[PDB]
Amino acid sequence: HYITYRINNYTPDMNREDVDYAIRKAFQVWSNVTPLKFSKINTGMADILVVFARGAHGDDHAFDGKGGILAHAFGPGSGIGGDAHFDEDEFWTTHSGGTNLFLTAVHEIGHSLGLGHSSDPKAVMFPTYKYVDINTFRLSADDIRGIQSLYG
Ligand SMILES: COc1ccc(-c2ccc(S(=O)(=O)c3ccccc3CC(=O)NO)cc2)cc1
Ligand SMILES: [Ca+2]
Ligand SMILES: [Ca+2]
Ligand SMILES: [Ca+2]
Ligand SMILES: [Zn+2]
Ligand SMILES: [Zn+2]
């Protein structure tokens, strides 16, 4: 129940502190509904690596340029397992005006922890990006069902 994460690199779209905050808040969403304890590391071997990259980036799932696929993430495992990759050809944002990193990271971390996609459009795990005010964002009951089915 104790999972480490590291931010490999920072999108130039955002301030470094804003990337840190968005990612920290995204892990907090999942920690708030599970026994999971997440610890950020700055250097070293983490369970979950966060990476921004474009096109082909070393995993056999190349990105596709601006638009299309925004991000993907691997389920829990050794190596690339757990990692969450964000397509740098998107414009990552703290709020709107691009693709919101926090919301996207909530979705990807879901996959990092072993979740698939939901058929509930209110779930963060439903694979349609839609901006919502970050302060009013809430996991759906379907997301909570999924994650609690794995942890606890
Ligand atoms: C509410 O906040 C949200 C909800 C959903 C996502 C989300 C939605 C879609 C995608 S995507 O990369 O375009 C995509 C679209 C369809 C099928 C697969 C994918 C890849 C994917 O599911 N990555 O996790 C990636 C992230 C992002 C943020
Ligand atoms: Ca893309
Ligand atoms: Ca990993
Ligand atoms: Ca970018
Ligand atoms: Zn990748
Ligand atoms: Zn997804």
Side-chain angles (χ1 to χ4, degrees):
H1 292 158
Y2 178 86
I3 300 172
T4 56
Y5 76 92
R6 176 161 65 84
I7 296 175
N8 176 70
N9 69 298
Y10 290 83
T11 175
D13 310 341
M14 296 171 48
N15 289 312
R16 170 195 192 93
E17 284 187 302
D18 296 338
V19 179
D20 286 335
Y21 186 67
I23 299 302
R24 159 185 159 239
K25 285 307 168 194
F27 277 106
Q28 167 177 92
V29 166
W30 293 114
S31 179
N32 284 345
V33 296
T34 69
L36 295 178
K37 212 289 167 53
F38 297 113
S39 177
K40 185 186 177 71
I41 69 179
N42 297 324
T43 59
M45 298 194 68
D47 294 306
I48 293 172
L49 196 70
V50 170
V51 178
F52 299 84
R54 71 172 66 73
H57 60 276
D59 65 11
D60 304 325
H61 301 270
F63 287 137
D64 58 354
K66 187 166 202 301
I69 294 294
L70 304 173
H72 56 220
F74 295 83
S78 66
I80 213 165
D83 290 1
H85 294 165
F86 298 81
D87 188 351
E88 190 59 80
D89 288 330
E90 324 308 328
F91 189 71
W92 298 99
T93 58
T94 61
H95 295 78
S96 195
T99 304
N100 185 264
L101 180 46
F102 164 74
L103 297 176
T104 310
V106 176
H107 179 95
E108 299 309 320
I109 291 167
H111 293 309
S112 296
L113 292 170
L115 295 179
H117 287 151
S118 183
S119 62
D120 172 9
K122 292 197 277 292
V124 75
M125 299 318 298
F126 189 90
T128 288
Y129 172 91
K130 187 62 41 66
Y131 183 70
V132 292
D133 306 353
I134 301 322
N135 311 282
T136 77
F137 168 75
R138 286 179 156 288
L139 292 177
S140 84
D142 191 68
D143 292 313
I144 289 153
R145 171 200 67 69
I147 201 69
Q148 294 197 345
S149 73
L150 293 168
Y151 299 101

